[PDB]
């Protein structure tokens, strides 16, 4: 049964709402037009609003290291609009990950098996010109694709 993916190949199709990894604009109704990625673009290219996900920890499962894994991702959300809009945008990203976990959603790279906040949506200082950042740590759980 396949190989375990890097966490971005499972989370990003689920937040974006399409299987095409080359197209970073989200199409999910709660997040239409939100750019979703692993890495913040150069100022001559970046567009807000923006969701960004990075792996911060989380081992493979010690029971079977090749069959289940529990990566922890720091999810973040940025906007140039106002602080309430970036709080609602992070809440609208949790409401996608929880539903995508209930439905056990398949992606070409693997299955999203479970979701758990380990540090919930938190306001912090932003490194960009005039934008509001909120962030939190999600412990995911991921299983390999069939065959």
């Amino acid at each position: 049964a396949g190989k375990l993916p890097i966490v971005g190949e499972v989370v990003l199709p689920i937040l974006r709402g399409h299987e095409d990894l080359s197209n970073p604009i989200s199409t999910v109704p709660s997040l239409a037009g939100v750019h979703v990625g692993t890495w913040v673009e150069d100022i001559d290219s970046r567009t807000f609003p923006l969701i960004t996900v990075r792996r911060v920890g989380g081992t493979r499962s010690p029971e079977h290291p090749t069959l289940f894994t529990q990566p922890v991702v720091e999810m973040t959300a940025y906007s140039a609009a106002d602080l309430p809009t970036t709080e609602q945008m992070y809440e609208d990203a949790l409401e996608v990950l929880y539903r995508a976990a209930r439905l056990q959603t398949k992606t070409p790279a693997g299955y999203l098996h479970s979701v758990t906040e380990t540090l919930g949506a938190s306001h912090g200082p932003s490194p960009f010109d005039r934008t509001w950042r909120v962030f939190g740590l999600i412990r995911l759980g991921i299983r390999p694709p069939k065959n």
């Binding site: 913040v40 150069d42 100022i43 990075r54 106002d82 809009t85 960009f128 005039r130």
Partner: protein
């Protein structure tokens, strides 16, 4: 005097670039907090830009690789004295087609009625 030279947006003098200047306005957010930001309607004008920020604790910050392709640029900026509008710290400028924020309130120099002028900083990151 260098304070009054500049020309106009369609044809500047030698040291001056044409810019669109968006002065500040205040908006309410969803929860009733008041936020400063740039107006929707810009003013065509000309401005004198000069390099800034070369001190060793800030010259290191010019390019980064921690979470994204981030860079930071800093310039002092001045409009000719015929520009009577003042850019409060929420304002923005379009220069060379890039969009540059004003950064902090204007510095006021006022030694005598012929020396007097305002100087801004603009920053992009």
């Amino acid at each position: 005097s260098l304070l009054d030279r500049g020309g106009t947006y369609g044809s500047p003098e030698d040291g001056f670039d044409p810019v669109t200047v968006y002065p500040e306005v205040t908006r309410k957010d969803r929860l009733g907090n008041t936020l400063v930001g740039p107006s929707l309607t810009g003013i065509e004008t000309v401005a004198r830009f000069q390099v800034q920020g070369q001190s060793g604790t800030s010259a290191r910050r010019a390019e980064m690789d921690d979470i994204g392709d981030m860079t930071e640029q800093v310039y002092t900026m001045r409009l000719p004295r015929s520009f009577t509008t003042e850019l409060k710290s929420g304002s923005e400028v379009v220069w060379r087609g890039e969009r540059w924020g004003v950064y902090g309130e204007p510095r006021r120099y006022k030694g005598s009625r012929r020396i007097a002028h305002l100087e801004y900083t603009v920053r992009r990151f």
